[PDB]
Amino acid sequence: KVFPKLAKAITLAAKDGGSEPDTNAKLRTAILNAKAQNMPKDNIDAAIKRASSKEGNLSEITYEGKANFGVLIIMECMTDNPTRTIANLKSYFNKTQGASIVPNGSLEFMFNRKSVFECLKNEVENLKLSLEDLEFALIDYGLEELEEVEDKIIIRGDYNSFKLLNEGFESLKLPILKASLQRIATTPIELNDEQMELTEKLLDRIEDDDDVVALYTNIE
Numbered sequence: 001k002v003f004p005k006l007a008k009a010i011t012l013a014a015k016d017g018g019s020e021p022d023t024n025a026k027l028r029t030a031i032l033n034a035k036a037q038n039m040p041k042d043n044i045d046a047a048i049k050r051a052s053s054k055e056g057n058l059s060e061i062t063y064e065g066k067a068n069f070g071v072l073i074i075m076e077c078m079t080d081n082p083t084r085t086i087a088n089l090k091s092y093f094n095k096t097q098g099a100s101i102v103p104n105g106s107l108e109f110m111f112n113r114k115s116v117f118e119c120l121k122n123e124v125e126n127l128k129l130s131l132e133d134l135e136f137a138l139i140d141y142g143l144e145e146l147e148e149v150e151d152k153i154i155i156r157g158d159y160n161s162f163k164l165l166n167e168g169f170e171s172l173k174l175p176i177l178k179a180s181l182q183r184i185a186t187t188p189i190e191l192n193d194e195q196m197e198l199t200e201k202l203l204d205r206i207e208d209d210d211d212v213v214a215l216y217t218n219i220e
Contacts, residue, residue: 003043005213006034008078010047012058019048025163029179036177055080063089064107067099067202069195072107074183075206076214085211092209096202111183111216113159115142117169118178121151127173134172141168152177185218 009030017024021031027048034044050056058078063086065073079085086101093099124134131153135146142161147154157165159181169176191199199219207215 002037003039004210005078006030006037006039007043007047008058008213010034010044011050011056012060012078014048014051015056015058019051025166029166032176033178033180061085062104063101064104065089065093065099065101066106067093067096067199069191069199070189070218071191071199072110072185072218073203073206074107074111074214074216075212076183076216077209077211078213079211085209088209088211089206092202092205095205099202109186110218111185114144114182114184115157115159115162115165116178116180116182117155117157117165117176119153119155119169119174120177121148121153123175123177124153129172134174137172138165138168141165141171143168182214183216185216187218188220189218190220 013024013026013030017026021028031044058080059082061077061079061082063075067073077085090101093101131146135143138155142157142165143155144157162181166179206212
């Protein structure tokens with residue numbers, strides 16, 4: 001469900017970055033995420049050690065697809081067998097009428113790559129700084145927008161601003177609940193209840209695949 005995939009990001013990051021967090025930014029980000037989610041220490045350690053084994057040959061691959069109702073799908077996967085992955089995904093689409101995987105690039109310019117940092121509303125108040133100060137401060141570190149979602153603050157910035165934004169959060173000594181790179185549709189679409197239900201069928205099968213670590217749609 002959630003741990004296996006959070007474990008895959010720790011292994012992948014270690015394989016092409018080293019098993020030393022102090023010198024591997026991505027590994028730190030992966031570790032931070034797993035921790036905030038409440039993955040036991042031994043598990044993480046197990047994910048870092050896996051990179052140096054026959055089970056550490058993971059890769060990040062993105063697939064693109066479309067479905068009825070003008071739906072566009074971006075699937076991010078980490079797998080130890082791209083052949084198996086592409087085959088399973090195709091079996092999911094070849095089960096839903098009107099849906100199909102398309103060549104990468106087909107959705108170009110339809111989505112935006114953004115850095116998304118989630119923070120706890122209680123953490124911000126901890127070091128006593130307003131949301132106004134948080135925004136003013138992070139504007140110099142890549143912040144494009146600040147949104148509020150009960151008990152937590154979500155800060156977004158361009159994809160390339162990931163590293164810097166992390167710097168900002170660390171400068172303010174503000175704990176990060178979750179840091180990631182997400183694909184956000186440029187032109188969101190809204191489906192009626194009937195459409196959402198029909199689409200949900202396909203979206204649930206995909207999300208359930210053990211290789212799909214991220215799923216982005218143009219749905220609002």
